[PDB]
């Protein structure tokens, strides 16, 4: 997994690859790692995939209720405080490593949080097995006062470094851009540089190739009238 977050002029951008693995085996080639905590607060998760999904949805759920209770749009610091206190309580047993980014009435924000509950602030961050490859790119090209277009470019380049160089990362680049005073734009499969080439052969079988012992209709309908 390679995940990055990059601050820019009027907001923040987050990006991720789309490979999920079981050891050395690729389970899903187009995984969605960019998660929505609230409309304009998004985060990307590395580590235990279900811990990243579950902790997002739980805090996302509570953030929504909090927003309704206070009649205010959710803040990134609230999502952060709720995430870290939940993760700290479980002493790293919930293996969620997240980059949390968003915009709110206070402004634009970018944070990282690790499984044990420690958080960090930054203008550029990377997480996952391809974080070192990504951070190499970020440390080479990041500057203050990036534009939206520059930040999207830098973020996706950092993910690409992970895709090509990290075996844990691959396939596509997902991006989400959160700009102040605008709707957050989720760009699913922003880049697609790993389409499989056409195979040499079609492996469609002739009908009746498989040996069959018994056939029967399965009753999926409910008990019928009359």
């Amino acid at each position: 997994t390679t995940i990055v977050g990059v601050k820019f002029n009027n907001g923040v951008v987050i990006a991720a690859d789309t490979r999920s693995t079981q050891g050395p085996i690729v389970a899903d080639k187009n995984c969605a790692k960019l998660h929505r905590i609230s409309p304009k607060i998004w985060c990307a998760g590395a580590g235990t995939a279900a811990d990243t999904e579950a902790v997002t949805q739980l805090i996302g759920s509570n953030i929504e209720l909090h927003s309704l209770y206070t009649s205010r749009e959710p803040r990134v610091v609230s999502a952060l405080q709720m995430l870290k206190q939940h993760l700290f309580k479980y002493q790293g047993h919930i293996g969620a490593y997240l980059i949390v980014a968003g915009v709110d009435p206070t402004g634009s924000h970018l944070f990282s949080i690790d499984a044990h509950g420690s958080t960090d602030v930054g203008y550029y961050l990377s997480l996952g097995s391809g974080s070192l490859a990504a951070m190499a790119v970020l440390e080479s090209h990041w500057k203050q006062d990036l534009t939206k277009e520059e930040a999207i470019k830098l973020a996706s380049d950092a993910i690409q470094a992970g895709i090509w160089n990290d075996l844990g990362s691959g396939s596509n680049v997902d991006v989400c851009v959160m700009e102040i005073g605008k709707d957050a734009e989720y760009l699913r499969n922003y880049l697609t540089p790993n389409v499989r080439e056409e195979k040499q052969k079609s492996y469609k079988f002739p009908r009746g190739t498989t040996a069959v012992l018994k056939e029967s209709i399965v009753n999926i309908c409910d008990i019928q009238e009359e």
Partner: protein, 196 residues
């Protein structure tokens, strides 16, 4: 990590490097290890980042609630709350915390709380992995009732040496000055302190 707090004539100054490592990888080279638990009561954190952050947040909460009821807490009171958390949860914590604050009655005060959760009031304190390399230097160079400029130089030179020898320390030298005049943040970059 290299952290220290030093009392001087007009109050106290906290100092820290900015390096946070995961093994040999520098996970954050611009970390802020100087944390505010009250207006003029700050702390330097060493050990588990999760633990020291959790502790600091709880202390900040306690001092906020204290202030609402009883007014501004003393630095000693803040140190006591830190100690209570560290001592009672010693089995599950890895935290080494220096507490520094400015009263008008007591002026600059420094309390160090090492791993066990004991408290020690000192004229100055050093902690973190990098502190080992500057026990000799700090002991030889510290004087009581230094000026602001002298104390800044003392901390700058000390943390410079800690950074030079300790791989776990590095980045910028952050400092927070606590006096009657208010709260001042200082930062010093490698090109400055490496040539000292």
């Amino acid at each position: 990590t290299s952290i220290m707090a030093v009392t001087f004539k007009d109050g106290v100054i906290l100092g820290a490097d900015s390096r946070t490592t995961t093994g040999a990888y520098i996970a954050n080279r611009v970390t802020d290890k100087l944390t505010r638990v009250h207006d003029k009561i700050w702390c330097c954190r060493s050990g588990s980042a999760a633990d020291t952050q959790a502790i600091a947040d709880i202390v900040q909460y306690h001092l906020e609630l204290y202030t609402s009821q009883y007014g501004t807490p003393s630095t000693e009171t803040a140190a006591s709350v830190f100690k209570e958390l560290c001592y009672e949860n010693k089995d599950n914590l890895t935290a080494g915390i220096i507490v520094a604050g400015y009263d008008d009655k007591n002026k600059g005060e420094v309390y160090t709380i090492p791993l066990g959760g004991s408290v020690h009031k000192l004229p100055y304190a050093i902690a973190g992995s990098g502190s080992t390399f500057i026990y000799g230097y700090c002991d030889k160079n510290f004087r009581e009732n230094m000026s602001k400029e002298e104390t800044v130089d003392f901390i700058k030179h000390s943390l410079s040496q800690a950074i030079k020898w300790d791989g776990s320390s590095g980045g910028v030298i952050r400092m927070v000055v606590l006096t009657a005049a208010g709260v001042e943040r200082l930062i010093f970059y490698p090109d400055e302190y490496e040539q000292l």
